[PDB]
Design a protein around this ligand. Sequence first.
Ligand SMILES: [Zn+2]
Ligand SMILES: [Zn+2]
Ligand SMILES: [Zn+2]
Ligand SMILES: [Zn+2]
Lengths: 139, 34, 98, 103, 49, 106, 159, 56, 171, 444, 93
Amino acid sequence: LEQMQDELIQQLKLQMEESAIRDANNIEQGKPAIFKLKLLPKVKDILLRANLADSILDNNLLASVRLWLEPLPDASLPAYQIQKVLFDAIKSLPIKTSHLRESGLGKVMVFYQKSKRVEPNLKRTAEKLISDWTRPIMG
Amino acid sequence: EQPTSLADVFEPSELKEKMLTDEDNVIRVTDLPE
Amino acid sequence: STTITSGLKYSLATGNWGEQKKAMSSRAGVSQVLNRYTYSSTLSHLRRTNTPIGRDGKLAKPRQLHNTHWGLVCPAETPEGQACGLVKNLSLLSGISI
Amino acid sequence: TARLYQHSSKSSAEYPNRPQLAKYCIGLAKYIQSPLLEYLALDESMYSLHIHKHQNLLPREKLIDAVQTSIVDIVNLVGVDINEAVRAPYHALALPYVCGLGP
Amino acid sequence: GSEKVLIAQERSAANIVQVFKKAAPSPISHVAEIRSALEKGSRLISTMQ
Amino acid sequence: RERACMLCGIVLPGRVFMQNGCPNCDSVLNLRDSDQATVNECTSSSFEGLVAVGDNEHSWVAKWLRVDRFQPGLYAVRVDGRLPSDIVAALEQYGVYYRPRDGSVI
Amino acid sequence: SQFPYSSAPLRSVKEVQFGLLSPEEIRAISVVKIEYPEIMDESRQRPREGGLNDPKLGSIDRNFKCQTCGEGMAECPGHFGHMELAKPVFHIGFIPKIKKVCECICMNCGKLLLDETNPTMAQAIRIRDPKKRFNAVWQLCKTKMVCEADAPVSRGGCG
Amino acid sequence: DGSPQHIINEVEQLLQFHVATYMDNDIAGQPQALQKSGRPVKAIRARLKGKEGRLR
Amino acid sequence: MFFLKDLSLILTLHPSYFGPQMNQYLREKLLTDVEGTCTGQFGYIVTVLDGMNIDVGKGRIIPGSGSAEFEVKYRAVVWKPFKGEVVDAIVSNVSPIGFFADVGPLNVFVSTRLIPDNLVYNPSNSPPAYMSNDELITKGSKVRLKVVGTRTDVNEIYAIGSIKEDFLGAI
Amino acid sequence: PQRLLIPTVDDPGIWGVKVRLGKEKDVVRQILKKKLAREGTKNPLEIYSAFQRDSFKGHVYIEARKAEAINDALKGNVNVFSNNSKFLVGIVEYKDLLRPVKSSDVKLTRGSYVRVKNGKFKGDLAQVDEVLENGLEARLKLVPRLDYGFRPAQRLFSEAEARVHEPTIRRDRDGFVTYGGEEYYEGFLYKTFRLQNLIVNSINPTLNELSLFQSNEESTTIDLSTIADSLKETAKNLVSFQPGDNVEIINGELNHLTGTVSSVNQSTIVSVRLHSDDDTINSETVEIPTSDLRKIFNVGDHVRVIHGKHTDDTGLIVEVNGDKVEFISNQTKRTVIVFSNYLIKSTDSTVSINESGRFELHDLVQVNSDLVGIVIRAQKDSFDVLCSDGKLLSLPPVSIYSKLNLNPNQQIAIDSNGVEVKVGDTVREFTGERRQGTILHVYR
Amino acid sequence: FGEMERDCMIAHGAAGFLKERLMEASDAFRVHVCGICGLMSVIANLKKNQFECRSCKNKTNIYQLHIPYAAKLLFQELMAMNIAPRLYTERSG
Ligand SMILES: [Zn+2]
Ligand SMILES: [Zn+2]
Ligand SMILES: [Zn+2]
Ligand SMILES: [Zn+2]
């Protein structure tokens, strides 16, 4: 049951990493990033399912989430749909300090907060999430 | 994020009306009646 | 001095018995223009009484001529239509206690 | 020239608080003072003046060239003061029509 | 400049007990009502049931 | 007429600043010992966000506004104008770092 | 014959189709965007353009012609403008229906809480009248208080 | 400019109230929108109903 | 390009014409009101086939105005240019801004920016023309052009041609 | 530091209380005075701080720990409303309540070009020579509006004309002249203006004023960095999108991709369906920010000018030179080159000429001293006139003499038989085509 | 000409008199409707002889109607409340 969900989430993790690598190569080959957009619906459907959050945190899928959120070496930001969906998923899940330590998403969150090409709404949401994640450390 | 050509500054019709084009400089420099 | 003056003048001029900004929910029609068509009409108007039961939720019993009305209100004089029975006229020897 | 001046926005900029008849009278007075400068002030509307009976039979380019040649000849026969032209643009209207020169 | 007349307004007397029979679709069968008014000023103050 | 001392953030009448100086910044500004130009360059009448502080030690707001080491009184969230370059250098000579309260620096 | 000649053919209404107005249609049929609360420009005639009395909306004065159609007061039907809302708000006439629709669907996956597998649900869908169809679907799906991420196989729900 | 949630809630609720009363000023359970004269505002819904409405 | 289309027309007849010759009169009225007209939706209607045997049906009396309304269905030849189509033409005028050609009833204007550069306009030539070393296009010269854009007017159509691609220009 | 000072759970709470409008600072001062007076007493006001913000009208925020402390602070005040309208501020809001405002620009920049809100030069473009440190006023460089003895047109202050019309000119420095109490520096007025007298955003510059300002700089438009920034702002703000527009993507992973706008939401999120050789990709809709979209204009499309000198001009695209697009006009029937930022693909023109010029349709006007005609079609830039001869002409509105206003005692028509025929009557040609129609105007 | 008079005229069966009373002897009006969207959004300019519905981007499929001015006002007030009454001159089934 839970182990089956963990296996499926690990398969999703492998698919997401492979899609990110393929899109990075395609951009390096002069082609638009399409694989991330293709995989976006399934990732959205999986993330929207609340009962799978525990298995997601068991498999540390936030590492692949950060990998997708990490800007590519061409200094090009990811597609706005991907950013919006990932922000909504991050809001929808109970992220703890241990999960952040495993994933290290705080660095990308700070980068998004400091950046200006990022949408101002995403900027405000990043500030809110960073404050919420700093809340437990100080009390 | 960080970056003069008068062609981009104003419409070419307005520039030609105000006499700020390359033909204008050539005519002014040229030693001939217009 | 304008407060009392304007309040009294407005209530007497328009007939709305209340404050000017609370015209709704106030009892209207208290003050009316004196009827001067003929002498009898003026005399009748100066001795007129009103029952503020209104039109909503009407019933026949308030409009009826009751036994106890004998000698105090006119059995014959009443308007037609909506206000029939609700508007009464004092009898010719009646008075109101002070 | 007075009729055309009473409708030109040049008068409106020059006289923002004056009636149209005042502009017409000013145009008449300026025409009396100097017909050549008033004819120059027409700019493009000078080509719509009734010059010849069959003025419309000629192509627009030929009529424009004829007007340009006539006005250049007349202004060169007259002569233009450079200092006054610098002092006032109204007197500087005649500067482009001098021989050798141009707009 | 206009002549206005005050029409006398009829109201139920105060300081008297009125007993009424309520209709069937109600848990209440009979009601005793009284409205109070001070003698000085003859102004309505409160109602009790 | 009231002005906001740029350095400490306190707000007092400009004539009070001229006659007596800033009770907190006098150790580094010498506002009383300064002319009207220096008073204006360190106290500005154009400001926003009047703040009244009762207990500097325990008020989190005072720590957030860095006024927990100053005299309680009228303070401004934002003050129009910054310290001049010469006054900035003079304060840096004393070893004190100046953080603008103009809001444009954060 | 009391109307000025128009080359468009003259026909009579045969059907009235109702419905709601999409924001795209509201923006399309509009002729100006209303943004300035001031009714009058400077209280010197010529009401402010982009305000609530823009001349493009139509003319109600005899000597003023509409700036959009060019017709007189007797012929101008009036033209609509649109106002963009900073935050979406409820339509006061549809709040009960909005509540019912929220009860009928899942708030996360955006799908119906019941499917055609249920014989009663299929029977309800079989009906034709939209109002009675919605009433039956609401009567059924009201009881269903949990979204199913799996078939009661995945039905598309989020659980 | 700046977003205290309490202020945002208050102002957005005011906007919702104004838009709602612009189309229906007889919403049971809350006070009506009033003019400076004290009379209630004649909403669009009130234009269409009654003997004196549009249809009748 | 020419086509055959089945079109319909609404014809209103005044009561003063309610005579035995009603049908023939409707026929000539249709012919006069359709032959040669230009509609942006269809293009140009050039002729009506079987013009003397068109069915008109029964006219309906308009309530309150007496006039009868007839629905006339007919088959007609229609010509309409299309975007990106190459057709033959005859030059009608030469001008510095470009030259005007005629494709049947349609008059097409081609600007200099859509003309090959080697075809320099020669105003000294008699008549003035846009000529090159081996090409000379003047009034009355056959030209093969491709229609790029069509402009719709009330009862007129304006088309723009080009000769800048291969197999175009003089023919 | 600044980050470490963010509030914690054990930090003192913050309450907000509604008060009467305009009394917020008064309540703050009263609270401070009460705290000082009761300080050092048996029952001091147990609060920590209190403040208010100008934007958050009607609210006063007090930092304390107990509701009784708030009641004690508010006790004895008249600006507090009858009801205890107090609420607990959320801890996250603590940073926002004290965050600064108006941080968009370091501050008004000296040398920038601005517009004037009100005064003798209402609307005139002005350069910010000096910014006063107070921030309420600023010294500005303007074009003088003088008559030298309803406002005169702007014109550089001419010292010779000023002396001729008024010999009381003062001199203080070389190139700095004071005339009539007004300081003019090298022909340009220098006058301080209030911040409440300026528009520092959405500034619309004109070349004429730009040339008049930059001529003294020995180069036409050289303050070009700020000019370039203004150009960027005008290009960015003027773009408006509609469904079905063909657009191209400038940034992002999807850079250099074409697509059609499907739906528009707000003004910053646009749903786009992309076009590509792969069918599975063409069936996807992507929401893309408008800041990374550029309109795609294909040759042979009806396009209408949005803004500029050629506003409301339409035509067909002919040449696409990247940023600048060329199209043949419809009214003038001549090629016009305008930036792609000023064009919208509008398949239908339907241009209305009302509120323009002096003449409307069907106006009998006098072309010149000899030719008299009537208007057949009006344009935004000119008019089309059919004359009595039977020919067509195109002339600017200025060139036309005037409308021939004729009374019915002047506009009289007599038919062949001698019967008078008035305006609007229907007559039929006796010979020729034998046409008929309604009379529009009668002349000779 | 109230509702009871309208019912009496219906009982008599005189449809022409009723139409004339309520249109010609009262607020008669002429509007243009798009043949596609069915809304009264056509920007008609009679003197220039050009009709155009911006939403549907058509210039041809346009008809004119004779309706009471009160009906036009009612439809416009309905559109003010986000309700779209579309008038079509042909049936569909
Ligand atoms: Zn200080
Ligand atoms: Zn109109
Ligand atoms: Zn669900
Ligand atoms: Zn339509």
